[PDB]
Structure formats: C-alpha cells, structure tokens
Amino acid sequence: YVNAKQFHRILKRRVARQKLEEQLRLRKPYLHESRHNHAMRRPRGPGGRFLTA
Amino acid sequence: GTARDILTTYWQHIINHLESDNHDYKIHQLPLARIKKVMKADPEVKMISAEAPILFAKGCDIFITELTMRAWIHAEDNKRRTLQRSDIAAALSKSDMFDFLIDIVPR
Amino acid sequence: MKEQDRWLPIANVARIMKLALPENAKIAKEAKECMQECVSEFISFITSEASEKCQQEKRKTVNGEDILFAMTSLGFENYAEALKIYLSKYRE
DNA sequence: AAACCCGCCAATCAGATGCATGATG
DNA sequence: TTCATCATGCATCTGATTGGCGGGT
Ligand SMILES: O=S([O-])[O-]
C-alpha cells in the first residue's frame, strides 16, 4: 500500500532531504539569542504574563 | 453540526467561500516571502511566479484546516479537548492522500 | 539559504489550526510543530513535481498552472480544482 | 493523587512587504 | 521593438518570537 501517484515524488524528496541534511549539517529551545534575552529581561506580572513598561 | 459533519461538508463550504466572499490577494494567514523561501530551498527550482506562493498561501490554509479537523475527530473519540501529535499521526493513516508525509510523521 | 527557510513560521500555522477548532479547544506544542513540518513538506513535495516538469520543458519559471498540474498529478485534485477557481478570480 | 503542559500577556527586532531598477524571453 | 514579469537591493515598519506561572489535562 503506497499512493501510486506519490510513490516516485516521495523517494525523489527523501534523497533531496538527505542532501539538505548533509549541507545544513551543524529543533532548538529558541531560534534567536536577541529575542530570548528580551523575553527573560522583560518585566512580568505575578502570573508570569508579560506587561507594558 | 458534529466534527464529522463539518468535515463531510468541508469542500462544499470552501467552494462557497471561494465563489462568494471577496478575497484580499495581498493579506494572507501565511507570509508569501516564507512560502517562496521554502520553494527556493530546492536547488532544482530557479525562478518562481508571483501567482505560485499566492496559490500555496490559500492551498496551505485549506491543507492545515482540513488536517486539523481530521486530527480533532481522533481527539473527540478519546474525549480529549487538547489536540496531540498522535491525533495528526492517526489522521494521516486514514487517507492515502497523506502518504507523502510518511518520512515527516513516522510509524 | 538559512536552515529555517525550509519551514513556515509556527505562530501563523498555529493560528490557522486555532480557527479550524472549536473556541474551547487546546493544541499541544508538538501538534503545532508536526503541522508546521507537514504543511512545509506539502509545499516542497508539490513544488518538486512542478520543478522537474519545468526542467524537462526547458522553462526557468515555476508558474501558477505548474502548481495546479503537479497537485492533480500527485492526487490533490480537490486542491488543484479549488485553487483553479481561486486563480481565475485573481487574474479577473 | 501528581505529573504534565498550554493559554495568557505585549516589546523588541528579524524579516515581510512594497517599490525602483535592470535583466530576460 | 515592445511588453510582461522575473530577481535583486533597499527603505519602511510590522507582527512573530518569547517564557514563568496556574489550573486544566
Ligand atoms: O513505501 S514508501 O517508501 O514509498
């Protein structure tokens, strides 16, 4: 059981994704160091909600 | 108006909204620049038409919505009101249209 | 080409999911991530099919009808035919 | 019981959008 | 030659990213 319409394109994508892992060789808790810091630094209510300056 | 009943009429409503409601071809739920970056991630892809990410913007909106509603049905059957990853995994296995996601969502 | 260029932003995906569910519903973070990965592959999967057809026909631009043709070829006929109506409106 | 974990909040700044230019067919 | 439409670079400014807590799961 494989979708005959998608079979060839699935294996084309599997090889393509394998190249891209090899190339991008190097998910994270956060994406950006600057925004992570912003959120940690920011003032919060007692509930842990962010608020205005 | 049960979960299975709104999924049954899903494409009827999609086509009604396409035929009636006046669209905004700039404003989307998904940003066009990121859709284009995903397309450009493929080395074989060279140039992309302005129309292509616009079609994907609406296509992906329909896709996320359809799969979310399919996954929600599995959540209701286990009497949970929190949508899990296993609910999406269960939804993919119910239609061979999702066979392309076999490597993305294993088992 | 950044490594996050492969995926759509999780907040935009999570908002569409939220609209598709009843008001009281909750969504797990893994479900948001899973959906982000699925919809991103949806784009890559279809675009790859359209891309290879453009190569064989010696065309550089992946255009609108190439995406619809690919969607039909790969068994997304509901998406192909619905977005064909949507396209004729945009062009109108 | 008792782990587990997702919605709530809004400011910064990564990046999305829109326009001018030159290339391309 | 002209037209339609692409990538690219740049200016403008906008909304995605972000985490501690509590109570629902
Ligand atoms: O069986 S799947 O790998 O096409």
Query: For chain A, what are the domain ranges?
Result: 1-53
Query: Method used for this model?
Result: X-ray
Reported resolution, Å: 2.6
Residue B105 in tokens: 């969502």
The span from the CA of C92 to the CA of C31, in Å, is 38
In chain B, DSSP assigns E strands to 47-48, 82-83
CATH number of domain containing C78? 1.10.20.10
Closest residue, CA to C1' of E5: B49
Report all structural domains of chain B as residue ranges with CATH numbers, in order of start.
Answer: 3-101 (1.10.20.10)
Q: Which residues touch strand E (CB under 7 A)?
A: A 29-32, 35-36, 38-40, 44, 46-50; B 31, 47-51, 80-82; C 9-12, 15, 26, 61, 63
Task: Using most ligand atoms within 8 A of CB, pick from B92, B101, B102 the residue to mutate for ligand 1.
Answer: B102
* Angle B51-B8-C76 from CA coordinates, rounded to 5°: 35
The span from the CA of C61 to the CA of A49, in Å, is 47
Q: Determine how β-strand C61-62 pairs with β-strand C26-27.
A: unpaired
Give CB contacts under 8 A, 24+ apart, made by A3-9. Answer: A3/B96, A3/B97, A3/B99, A3/B100, A3/C75, A5/C73, A5/C74, A5/C75, A6/B99, A6/B100, A6/C45, A6/C74, A6/C75, A9/B100, A9/C45, A9/C48, A9/C49, A9/C74
Per this entry, what is the length of chain B? 107
Residue B56 in tokens: 């994907």
The span from the CA of B70 to the CA of B73, in Å, is 5
* Assigned CATH topology for domain A1-53: 6.10.250
The helix or strand, by DSSP H or E, that contains position C26, with its residue range, turns out to be strand C26-27
Nearest atom (ligand 1) to Cα of A10: 4
Domain that holds residue C7: 1-92
The span from the CA of C68 to the CA of B16, in Å, is 20
Per this entry, what is the length of chain C? 92
Residue B66 in tokens: 């359809």
| Nearest alpha-carbon partner for B97 in C7, C83, C30, A4 | A4
Interchain pair A12, C4: CB under 8 A? no
For residue B94, what are the contacts with CB-CB under 8 A and spacing of at least 6? Answer: B70
**CB B67, CB C1: distance < 8 Å:** no
**CB B3, CB B69: distance < 8 Å:** yes
**CB C77, CB B41: distance < 8 Å:** no
Nearest atom (ligand 1) to Cα of A7: 4
Sign of CA dihedral B22, B24, B28, B34: positive
Name the domain count of chain C: 1
